[PDB]
RNA sequence: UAGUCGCUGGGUAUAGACCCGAAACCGGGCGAUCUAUCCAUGAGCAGGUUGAAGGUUAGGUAACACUGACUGGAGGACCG
């Protein structure tokens, strides 16, 4: 549901090596933006299970990436959790 | 082959007709200061319990859900 401009400004805001789209932080930010964006769509369309499957897949991907990042570096983990405003 | 009109008595008819005695029917009125409903305007209900919805907060959820604590004061509720 994201746009080209939205993704570009997200990666610009969260890039860590001036051209890295694969670092955990960028992917986590993109997934969080998409999850937050799809909420209002699912507010109106409660009977759309087929898309909610993809939403759950994105949630699982974000969870796994956060777990890996926490396992690797605690400081970057805490910083990312702080900026994204999510519990854990 | 004598009837008529009085008077006095015994009967009869129509009248309450020897006297007392119903439950009832019909007509015009009087009553909702009792009581039954209703309408307007007032006032009365000591004292003590229980504790719904809701709210706040801390968790928790992708989000809605869902838990605890505090609060709150419902009811043809409870004891009197
Ligand atoms: Mg004579
Ligand atoms: Mg005579
Ligand atoms: Mg006589
Ligand atoms: Mg007589
Ligand atoms: Mg008589
Ligand atoms: Mg008698
Ligand atoms: Mg009468
Ligand atoms: Mg009377
Ligand atoms: Mg009266
Ligand atoms: Mg009565
Ligand atoms: Mg009154
Ligand atoms: Mg009282
Ligand atoms: Mg009541
Ligand atoms: Mg009531
Ligand atoms: Mg009653
Ligand atoms: Mg009662
Ligand atoms: Mg009682
Ligand atoms: Mg008593």
């Amino acid at each position: 549901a994201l746009s080209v401009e939205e993704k570009a400004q997200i990666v610009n805001e969260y890039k860590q090596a001036e051209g890295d789209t694969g670092s955990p932080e960028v992917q986590v930010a993109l997934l969080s933006a998409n999850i937050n964006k799809l909420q209002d769509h699912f507010k109106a369309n409660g009977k759309d299970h087929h898309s909610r499957r993809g939403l759950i897949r994105m949630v699982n991907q974000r969870r796994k990436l956060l777990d890996y990042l926490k396992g690797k570096d605690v400081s970057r983990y805490t910083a990312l959790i702080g900026r994204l405003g999510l519990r854990r």
Side-chain angles (χ1 to χ4, degrees):
Chain A
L2 288 189
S3 305
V4 176
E5 297 89 344
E6 269 165 341
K7 292 181 181 179
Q9 63 84 30
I10 283 176
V11 54
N12 189 359
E13 184 179 341
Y14 278 95
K15 65 179 73 175
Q16 188 176 2
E18 203 262 322
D20 54 336
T21 65
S23 57
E25 300 88 354
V26 192
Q27 318 192 231
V28 166
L30 296 154
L31 288 167
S32 296
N34 214 347
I35 292 159
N36 280 334
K37 182 175 174 66
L38 268 174
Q39 295 298 109
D40 70 340
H41 158 69
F42 282 120
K43 293 255 198 178
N45 312 104
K47 284 301 133 179
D48 190 1
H49 314 297
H50 288 66
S51 297
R52 186 179 295 275
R53 183 176 176 86
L55 163 70
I56 302 314
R57 187 269 186 189
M58 294 183 286
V59 162
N60 281 313
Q61 269 306 309
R62 180 176 68 159
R63 178 71 275 172
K64 287 172 182 181
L65 284 174
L66 277 185
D67 277 326
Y68 165 65
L69 186 49
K70 183 178 184 293
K72 182 62 66 68
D73 194 309
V74 309
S75 68
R76 317 170 41 178
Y77 176 60
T78 61
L80 201 61
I81 301 299
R83 319 193 38 201
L84 276 296
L86 61 83
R87 301 188 292 301
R88 200 195 66 258

